[PDB]
Amino acid sequence: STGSATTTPIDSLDDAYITPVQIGTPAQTLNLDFDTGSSDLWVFSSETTASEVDGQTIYTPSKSTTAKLLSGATWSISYGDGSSSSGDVYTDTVSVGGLTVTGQAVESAKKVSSSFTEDSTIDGLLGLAFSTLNTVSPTQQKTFFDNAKASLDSPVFTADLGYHAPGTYNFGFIDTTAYTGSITYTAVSTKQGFWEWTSTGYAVGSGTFKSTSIDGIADTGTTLLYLPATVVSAYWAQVSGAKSSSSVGGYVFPCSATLPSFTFGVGSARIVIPGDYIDFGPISTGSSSCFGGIQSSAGIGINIFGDVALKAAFVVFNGATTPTLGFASK
Ligand SMILES: NC[C@@H](O)c1ccc(Cl)cc1
Question: Nearest residue CA, atom 11 of ligand 1?
Fold first, then answer.
């Protein structure tokens, strides 16, 4: 089997991407944030505290003939940005872009933190990291990808995120028309539960490439590119007027600036992030100070190849027995 679904930026900055997901019988379609940095599939629901729901589409398991309460199971998750959610668990039929999983754990939110409430466009998350990170207790549950894997033509999914445009998540096949050149594959460590890999270095604009190992995770659920302070300093030093602002919480730059590109290494191959991708616009409405898309990872404990980096590439998440990551230009 295969599946193919369009993923769409939630706003004009590409802060996140939503992908339609069918849950239950008859189908209830929710727009979920596909997150390769977590492993829970959770949704706003009929059980979510009413004061904490504001515009989202909710899953109502009582209206699904295939929904079954997973007796005694609860979940609770906190994300890197400080947001959180928790609730109980059903199993139900879940389809993504024509690919169907029966008996998928669908985690129903009883509580969500303010940032989820405030974002009307995201109805939940669909986690695509390794199932070892799943938070369901007392019996840990498998991701959608893990459940689908054996049925897929090939045990892979791919992320093809757009810049200020729709993109695609495919399951079970590699679309050879979606990228240019060849895909370069690189080794993955699963020891922390993430798609963790090692970039071979970087360049700033037309600068010379610096060979240096950068350990990081491929995370579709993180907006920006978070890299070591040395690297980030070297990038923003090439932008006149750029500075790290403790009050704003990172690097800002004059909105009148032209940003250089940023290249990262995948083995001997190179992915170029155009400078426009690194512009996240005014720090506040009407400001002439703009927020940078490349930020320091200091105090995270790991580097994060988030959407800024990933949307510059066609990315293969290979879930074979020995997982690997593939990157191609597009
Ligand atoms: N995208 C999931 C989010 O909780 C996350 C996961 C891992 C890191 Cl290092 C940062 C943020």
Answer: 80
With a 6 A CB cut-off, is 146 part of the ligand 1 pocket? no
Structure tokens at 122: 């995201």
- CATH code, domain with 62: 2.40.70.10
SS3 244: strand
Residue the block writes with tokens 């600068």 = 207
Q: Is the CB of 272 under 6 A from ligand 1?
A: no
Q: From the alpha carbon of 77, which atom of ligand 1 is closest?
A: 4
Which are the catalytic amino acids? 35, 199
Expt. technique? X-ray
For residue 122, the 8-state DSSP code is -
Q: For the chain, what is the domain count?
A: 2
The C-alpha atoms of residue 187 and residue 324 are separated, in whole angstroms, by 5
| Ligand 1 near 78 CB (within 6 A) | no
**What Å resolution does this PDB entry report?**
1.7
Please tell me the distance from the alpha carbon of residue 93 to that of residue 76, in angstroms, as a whole number: 22
What range does the domain containing 54 cover? Answer: 5-174
Please indicate whether residue 303, judged by its CB atom, sits closer than 6 Å to ligand 1. no
Distance CA 228, CA 300 (A): 10
The DSSP bridge pattern shows strands 17-23 and 28-35 to be antiparallel
